[PDB]
Amino acid sequence: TNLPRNPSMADYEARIFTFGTWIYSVNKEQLARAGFYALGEGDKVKCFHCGGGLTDWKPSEDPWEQHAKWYPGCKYLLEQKGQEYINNIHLTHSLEECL
């Protein structure tokens, strides 16, 4: 049902390879472990499983967190971090708006 959108990038090694020319603050090993691979069009990266694309990284920012924040539907994310992790990121935002 929920098959990788890009099965060619399903291996960690495939993904890190893409970060050859990586010159940006955010750690390429962390991006890769969170399912992303670089597009060589700035700091743009894309999730191999959900196909979600992300840009304009700041130095502090966590790939996993951003993955959940923007693309919580990903099956890879769910297998790797679980329901609670994803829902936690979203409830956190709701509490911020509430108080």
Window 59 to 98, contacts with ligand C3T (CB under 6 A): 61, 66, 70
Lookup: tokens for 5: 């959108």
Which residue pairs from 77-86 have beta carbons closer than 8 angstroms and sit at least 24 positions apart in sequence? 77/34, 77/35, 77/47, 77/49, 77/50, 80/34, 80/35
Q: Is 55 in the site for ligand C3T (CB under 6 A)?
A: yes
Nearer to ligand C3T, 33 or 44 (CB): 44
Query: Which residues of the shown chain bind ligand C3T in the complex (CB under 6 A)?
Result: 39, 44, 46, 51, 53-58, 61, 66, 70
Q: Give the annotated binding-site residues.
A: 47, 50, 67, 74
